[PDB]
Design a protein around this ligand. Sequence first.
Ligand SMILES: [Ca+2]
Ligand SMILES: [Ca+2]
Ligand SMILES: [Ca+2]
Ligand SMILES: [Ca+2]
Lengths: 121, 121, 121, 121
Amino acid sequence: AWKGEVLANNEAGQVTSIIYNPGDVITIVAAGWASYGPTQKWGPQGDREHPDQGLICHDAFCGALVMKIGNSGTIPVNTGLFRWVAPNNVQGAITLIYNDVPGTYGNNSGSFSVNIGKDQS
Amino acid sequence: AWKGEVLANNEAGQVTSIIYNPGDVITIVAAGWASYGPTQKWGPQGDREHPDQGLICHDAFCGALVMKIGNSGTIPVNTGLFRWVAPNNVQGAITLIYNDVPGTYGNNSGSFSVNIGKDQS
Amino acid sequence: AWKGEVLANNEAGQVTSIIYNPGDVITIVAAGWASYGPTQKWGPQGDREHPDQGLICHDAFCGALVMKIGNSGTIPVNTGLFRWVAPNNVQGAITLIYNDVPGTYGNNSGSFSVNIGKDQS
Amino acid sequence: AWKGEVLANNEAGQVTSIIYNPGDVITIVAAGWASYGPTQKWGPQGDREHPDQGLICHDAFCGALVMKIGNSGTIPVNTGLFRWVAPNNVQGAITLIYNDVPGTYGNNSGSFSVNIGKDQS
Ligand SMILES: [Ca+2]
Ligand SMILES: [Ca+2]
Ligand SMILES: [Ca+2]
Ligand SMILES: [Ca+2]
């Protein structure tokens, strides 16, 4: 299992120790408070009122937690995933990333604390 | 395992099928959007800017998800719990509840979708 | 989880730290060598050639590992149980017992090493 | 998870659907009766009285269940493995095999029924 922090201003994302392999079932729980610029902060589902202006993940709100598995496209994580299996052909290291517009991470603040484990399968 | 919705306006809380027994390890993931009255909605961590005016759980924000186990006091759940063990002497059915002030649930809206499972132990 | 030895000559059985609760899923693996009297020894499935002359469990061979859950009747364990759920209304402490005829345990020898854990549910 | 039979006369072994990956925790439970030639049958720990005359696994008795993971050497399974982690650098498909001397499998009989699952990690 892995536990760590994902900083909102880390555009490259936070690599974890988790390698997702075919057939794996995983659980993720994410908590905490972060911002994509404003003084306000949002949880790992992000800001439901803010328009998408070029987010790295168009399937989650700005300020949400997302991930990549190997070199997949971004996949929403939000508050977490319960006993989840990846789409076919998706495998490799899990990288966690705050959802913002590329080039605009410098004014971000806060972080999410995230646990990831593999479940029985 | 249990999956279901917890309505923000349900003051009695949502009983689940999960009975927490001594030694159990559990995982909860909660998602969604709810309000304790305002037109805005918040995720399962609630509204970090709103003062506590007599919440059923003083250890979580207004609008957060909390629980009771048997007839315990309220315990914060927020976005979820990862491979969690209860305090000594806490056991019984898990009831999930939206954190608001007693008597003020009528103007609440939305709900959280919640998964709960028992982990290996 | 519990790990321990079950002595072949222990007529009362070996109490474990595992309380089986409704809905629990458990796994048991048992290993080792024991005898109900002869110089030979047998593994946890017992002696497939020996007649049942009044065994505590008529659904397993003499010399097999069996169990009780609370005050249930005996249930075969043999080499183990994989992600197993008990019958309806069966619950309580797990006691492991070598299968022999009551009153005839004094000439028994050896033991089984046994792991028991609860699985995800 | 995988469930299947491992025939005692199958010299090449039984390939399973389980690919053991770095960091995986697995559980195996094996049951049943088989023989390496004699009319008698033994359980998955094999025959503790028979000399090793060139077995594929010198760390288990003749007639025991063993495995390979990818192209590893043989590893004893016996009655099973509880929440087990492989040695460093061992990975790949799990193949289950009856322990006998190469070239002598033709007079073998019976089989073991085996479950393998991945555990939480
Ligand atoms: Ca920004
Ligand atoms: Ca309200
Ligand atoms: Ca005896
Ligand atoms: Ca043979």
